[PDB]
């Protein structure tokens, strides 16, 4: 039952999120976990995020802990 960060409050893009805007929920898919919690704090997404929106790799401009490919920044 690994909980995943699911945008609870409806937040658009270009809006740096923090801990209060990060709720670890157990829903599919797994989206982005909290491994980069202290690294995502202040991340701006590129796709509008509705309420309880599963964090996807498509709404992250500068991926912090993402060595899957975008490991340049």
Swiss-Prot record:
Detected in blood serum (at protein level). GO terms for cellular component: extracellular region. Residues 4-63 form the AFP-like domain. It is found in: Secreted. Its main location: secreted. The record marks 9, 14, 18, 44 as: Important for ice-binding. Keywords: Antifreeze protein, Repeat, Secreted. Residues 65-70 are annotated as: Linker. Belongs to the type-III AFP family. Contributes to protect fish blood from freezing at subzero sea water temperatures. Lowers the blood freezing point. Binds to nascent ice crystals and prevents further growth. This is Ice-structuring protein RD3. It comes from Lycodichthys dearborni.
């Amino acid at each position: 039952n690994k909980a995943s960060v699911v945008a609870n409050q409806l937040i658009p893009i270009n809006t740096a999120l923090t801990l209060i805007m990060m709720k670890a929920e157990v829903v599919t898919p797994m989206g982005i976990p909290a491994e980069e919690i202290p690294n995502l704090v202040g991340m701006q997404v590129n796709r509008a995020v509705p309420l309880g929106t599963t964090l996807m790799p498509d709404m992250v401009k500068n991926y912090e802990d993402g060595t899957t490919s975008p490991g340049l920044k």
